[PDB]
Design a protein around this ligand. Structure first.
Ligand SMILES: [Mg+2]
Ligand SMILES: [Mg+2]
Ligand SMILES: [Mg+2]
Ligand SMILES: [Mg+2]
Ligand SMILES: [Mg+2]
Ligand SMILES: [Mg+2]
Ligand SMILES: [Mg+2]
Ligand SMILES: [Mg+2]
Ligand SMILES: [Mg+2]
Ligand SMILES: [Mg+2]
Ligand SMILES: [Mg+2]
Ligand SMILES: [Mg+2]
Ligand SMILES: [Mg+2]
Ligand SMILES: [Mg+2]
Ligand SMILES: [Mg+2]
Ligand SMILES: [Mg+2]
Ligand SMILES: [Mg+2]
Lengths: 90, 76, 183, 98, 172, 169
RNA sequence: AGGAUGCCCCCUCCCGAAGGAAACCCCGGUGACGGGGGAGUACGAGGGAGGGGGUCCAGGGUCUGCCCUUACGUCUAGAAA
RNA sequence: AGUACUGAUCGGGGCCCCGGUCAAACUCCGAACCUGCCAGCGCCGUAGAAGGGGGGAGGCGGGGGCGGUGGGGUAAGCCUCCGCUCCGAGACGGGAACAACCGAGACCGGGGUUAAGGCCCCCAAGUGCGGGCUUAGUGUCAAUCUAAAAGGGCGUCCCCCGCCCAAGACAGCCGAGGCGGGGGGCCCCGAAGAUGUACAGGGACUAAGCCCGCCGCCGAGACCCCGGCCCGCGGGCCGUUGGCCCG
């Protein structure tokens, strides 16, 4: 089963930003979540996304619900995932 | 994410006040159109939205909306 | 510089993404505003719920004001019934007029595409000036009735007001030449 | 059963009058003087039915060709065929429309 | 005096099985083939005709730049020959854009000269002499939504407004 | 009598001018207003229930009579004739016809089949429209359950779907 | 009795109607995808020029694969009947 | 529409008044709409409008769709009228097949783009996108075409109203929601046939079903383009019972 949780690093599999990495920062409902690249980092804008269009990775950072990009970027440093985000899958 | 209180009525004489969780009023209205269209066979022209307003989670009536607000994870 | 891009309507499919692209290539940083529940694009400024005391903060913070006025503005200027109900102008008209006039007063940059120039003309902000408009019979007449000199160029700049015929038929070079012009 | 064709064969509605028009009609239609070239409208008066033209000519516009004693000779058309209607002025009205 | 708006009308549905009263009106509007297009002045007598054929055509306000492109690509003169810039200049029109603007703005009340029009000497005619009074368009690239439903409920028929220019560009 | 489906739909013009109809049948409904009909005593009643037609169609006279009997009997038994007013609101004006071979009904009726097909009178019906009130009841709010039951029984006798509307006077 | 100055392949070159992409960069959308650039480009019915290689080409008999396809004449509103 | 003339018809109140039910052979009112004349627009017309004369007919069995509750009839792929269109006398794409349903009008060859309709396989193009519903293989994108009613079901999803509970409500002290009514969506029962399988194209599908929306693509002889041919009309040249050229 697919599990999407706040802080999880995910990969987008649909849309122009396909193959890019992103961080889940909020939950809208059972079907949509909010992800942020951060944009300056991986090229993913801060938008809602349907769960069907993302796949979870094995990496997770710790943040609060609705975390800002700077808070996300800082948490990406305490985990050392900065170069993990710039890599494009497939 | 916010709870939107949507007040509306239909050409078929039905009235409704529902609470829908969404990012923006546009997303909440899309859920209202598709769900009412599904559950009552109502075309979008037959649905008249009269009022959309944010309601704080403390004062909402729907436990569905409250529970979505505090969700930390989803499963598919 | 920062530009505020008011997305009144999206019925013209490519108007907003094209206008934003040109402004970004023109060096601006674009903040998107929305004043109606029917617009589907992401935005950071909610002109529907923004209090009126916060307006003076808005004029100071932005150097340009662009209006993605699709067919909603077109049928409001003509005072005509649109073929679709979604093309009705469902925004706060008084706030919109207040925004345009105030930005114009502080001599900030105004980008008026398609039928927006006729809306600015009806506000009396282009009397005696050169402007272009979406060249249909009725819109050309409205410009002339408001003492505006119609010019048949794609992009026309009158000293702080840039008017374009149709952003979807405007090349990047033409738009950027007028952005970099002097006014 | 086939349609019968008496001279007045489907004229119940046409020859009926509302209560407010009962009785004699006014005499002003008698006093119009038509010259050749005038345009008239055939408006049948049911109180003088024996001199009225056929129902098919009600509402048609004709041109006055001349006079015959007290009747006016009117040139009109039924579809594409030229017809000559000879009738008295009580069944005529002036056509002001040209 | 009064300058009526200029409309573009495109015939979207075909000839066989068209009702008689609609077929007659389309013929008088010069839309005698499918995907034929005309530009008309929107006088009340003309608008009464468009209402009659509303379920067979689509129409809207045409803009001068779209008309300029239509003339350059699908404009034909007598003999079914292409309309060229040189032919315009011989008659005193400097460009496709100028004549299109003259017609849309109301400076001239007709785009193609009438059958009985007589060209003078030196004087620029108030139309384009011997231009065929109709355009034969290409089918729309990317298709339509539905030729059986009105544009107002998601089809393609009837009044389209300024979106007729988007459709024309796809049909050029 | 034929099955009522044979005369349910409105297929032609109303046929009611009895001065042009030979042998038009007599109406077989004895009363149309039941219970307490005097206007003074009806002022005590403060509720109104209506059996409303949902479709257009023709209701035969015997179905109206069957519906009138079952509802009025129920109200008489359970509510009491002094505590309600019931009115059959429509009158069977329309005359029904049938094309059958018969004796003692005219010489043309002796020709078989569709020759001389215009039928002889066969009954009466009421032509009703959607939303039209078929039965009308005035009652006291304490008897609401009984009045709804009486109208449910009336509806089971009628050839078209109906619905019960309860409103105050 | 027809062509063999042919036909076929390859390569190169020129022109080219209607029409017309892609990689990739940028803007939008949850998204299927849209738009600006790349680009009216690569290409495109066909029309021209040359070079290398081969041997028959056209036409015919018959069979196979794929696609299409309801004997004829007749009266009839209606024929595979 | 009205119930005022002519008639029909149910109640209340004192032959009158009030409320109600009706009318092909009733009408105070009264549309949409059709139609006459004039002016204009639009189109056709001097390459010949109107009008007139002459020769030859065929044909004088029609039919389909949709609309007039047309009128009749239990109904009919029924009988009999009125109007637009189509078949007859019309190719071609779609509809599983199928004169007349949808699309559309075919000189011949080639290129391109669309229409109806479709895009899991058969079969060209999506195992396309978001939301919701159904558990019955229900169902599987209009009609011809193979179906279904009154009625029953909180089966399940949803909307509204009334009342109780201010934690002393409902169910048998406990502690939080509870009881009733009206309606809507899908599905279940109602639902029974004769050569051969959940028939309505087959495989099969839990979506490849249904509802509210959306994106792209495929797809005719239609539309666009190129080449070839023929035709109507007009013009020209040639000693012509005819030939050739041009627009
Ligand atoms: Mg006769
Ligand atoms: Mg006499
Ligand atoms: Mg058709
Ligand atoms: Mg009938
Ligand atoms: Mg030889
Ligand atoms: Mg035979
Ligand atoms: Mg036979
Ligand atoms: Mg045969
Ligand atoms: Mg009535
Ligand atoms: Mg008539
Ligand atoms: Mg006959
Ligand atoms: Mg017929
Ligand atoms: Mg025959
Ligand atoms: Mg077929
Ligand atoms: Mg395939
Ligand atoms: Mg039935
Ligand atoms: Mg089944």
């Amino acid at each position: 089963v697919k599990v999407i949780d706040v802080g999880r690093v995910v990969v987008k599999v649909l849309g122009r930003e396909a193959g890019r990495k992103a961080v889940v920062v909020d939950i809208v409902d059972e079907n949509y979540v909010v992800i942020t690249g951060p944009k300056s980092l991986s090229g993913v804008r801060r938008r809602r996304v349907n769960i069907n269009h993302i796949e979870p990775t094995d990496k997770k950072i710790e943040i609060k619900k609705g975390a800002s990009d700077e808070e996300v970027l800082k948490a990406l440093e305490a985990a050392g995932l900065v170069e993990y985000m710039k890599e494009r899958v497939k | 994410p916010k709870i939107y209180r949507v007040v509306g009525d239909t050409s078929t004489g039905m009235k409704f006040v529902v609470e829908v969780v969404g990012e923006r009023p546009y997303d909440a209205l899309e859920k209202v159109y598709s769900v009412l269209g599904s559950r009552h066979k109502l075309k979008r022209t037959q649905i008249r939205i009269r009022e959309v307003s944010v309601v704080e989670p403390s004062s909402a009536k729907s436990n569905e909306a409250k529970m979505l607000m505090v969700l930390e994870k989803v499963v598919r | 510089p920062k530009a505020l891009l008011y997305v009144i309507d999206t019925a013209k499919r490519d108007e907003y993404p094209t206008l934003k692209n040109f402004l970004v290539k023109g060096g601006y940083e674009v903040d998107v505003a929305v004043g109606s529940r029917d617009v589907n694009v992401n935005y950071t400024v909610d002109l529907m719920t923004l209090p009126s005391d916060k307006l003076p903060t808005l004029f100071e913070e932005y150097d340009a004001f662009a209006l993605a006025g699709g067919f909603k503005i077109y049928y409001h200027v003509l005072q005509k019934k649109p073929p679709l109900k979604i093309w009705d102008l469902n925004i706060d008209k008084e706030r919109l007029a207040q925004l345009v006039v105030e930005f114009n007063r502080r001599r900030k940059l105004l980008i008026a595409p398609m039928a927006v120039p006729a809306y600015v003309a009806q506000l009396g902000l282009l009397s005696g000036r050169h402007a272009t408009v979406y060249p249909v019979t009725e819109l050309i007449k409205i410009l002339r009735d408001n003492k505006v000199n119609f010019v048949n160029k794609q992009v026309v700049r009158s000293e702080n007001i840039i008017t374009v015929k149709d952003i979807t038929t405007t090349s990047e070079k033409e738009f950027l030449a007028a952005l970099r012009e002097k006014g | 059963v086939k349609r019968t064709h008496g001279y007045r064969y489907k004229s119940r509605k046409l020859l009926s009058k509302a209560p407010r028009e009962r009785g004699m009609s006014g005499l002003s239609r008698l006093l119009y003087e038509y010259k050749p070239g005038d345009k008239v409208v055939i408006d049948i008066d049911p109180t003088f039915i024996s001199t009225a033209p056929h129902r098919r000519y009600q509402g048609k516009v004709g041109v006055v060709i001349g006079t015959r004693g007290r009747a006016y000779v009117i040139e009109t058309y039924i579809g594409d065929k030229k017809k000559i209607i000879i009738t008295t002025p009580e069944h005529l009205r002036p056509h002001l429309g040209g | 005096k009064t300058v009526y708006p200029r409309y573009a009308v495109i015939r979207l549905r075909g000839i066989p099985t068209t009702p008689g009263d609609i077929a007659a009106t389309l013929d008088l509007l010069r839309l005698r083939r499918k995907f034929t297009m005309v530009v008309v002045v929107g006088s009340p007598s003309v608008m009464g005709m468009i209402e009659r054929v509303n379920d067979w055509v689509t129409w809207g306000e045409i803009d001068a730049d779209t008309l300029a492109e239509v003339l350059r690509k699908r404009g034909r003169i007598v003999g079914d020959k292409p309309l060229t810039l040189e032919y315009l200049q011989k008659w005193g029109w400097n460009s496709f854009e100028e004549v299109a603007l003259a017609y849309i703005s109301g400076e001239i009340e007709t785009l193609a000269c009438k059958k009985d029009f007589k060209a003078r000497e030196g004087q620029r005619p108030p139309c384009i002499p011997y231009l065929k009074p109709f355009f034969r368009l290409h089918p729309p690239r990317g298709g339509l939504n539905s030729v059986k439903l009105h544009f107002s409920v998601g089809g393609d028929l009837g009044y389209r407004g300024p979106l007729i220019n988007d459709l024309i560009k796809r049909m050029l | 009598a034929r099955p009522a489906r044979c005369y349910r739909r409105i297929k032609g013009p109303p046929y009611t001018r009895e001065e042009y109809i030979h042998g038009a049948p007599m109406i077989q409904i004895p009363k149309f207003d039941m219970g307490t009909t005097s206007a003074a005593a009806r002022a005590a009643f403060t509720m109104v229930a209506k059996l409303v037609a949902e479709e257009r169609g023709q209701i035969r006279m015997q179905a109206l009579e069957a519906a009138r009997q079952i509802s009025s009997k129920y109200l008489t038994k359970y509510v009491g004739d002094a505590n309600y007013y019931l009115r059959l609101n429509v009158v069977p004006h329309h005359v029904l016809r049938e094309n059958r071979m018969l004796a003692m009904a005219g010489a043309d009726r002796l020709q078989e089949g569709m020759r001389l097909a215009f039928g002889s009178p066969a009954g009466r019906a009421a032509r009703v429209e959607p939303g039209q009130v078929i039965f009308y009841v005035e009652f006291k709010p304490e008897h609401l359950a009984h009045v709804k039951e009486a109208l449910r029984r009336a509806a089971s006798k009628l050839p078209i779907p109906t619905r019960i509307v309860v409103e105050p006077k």
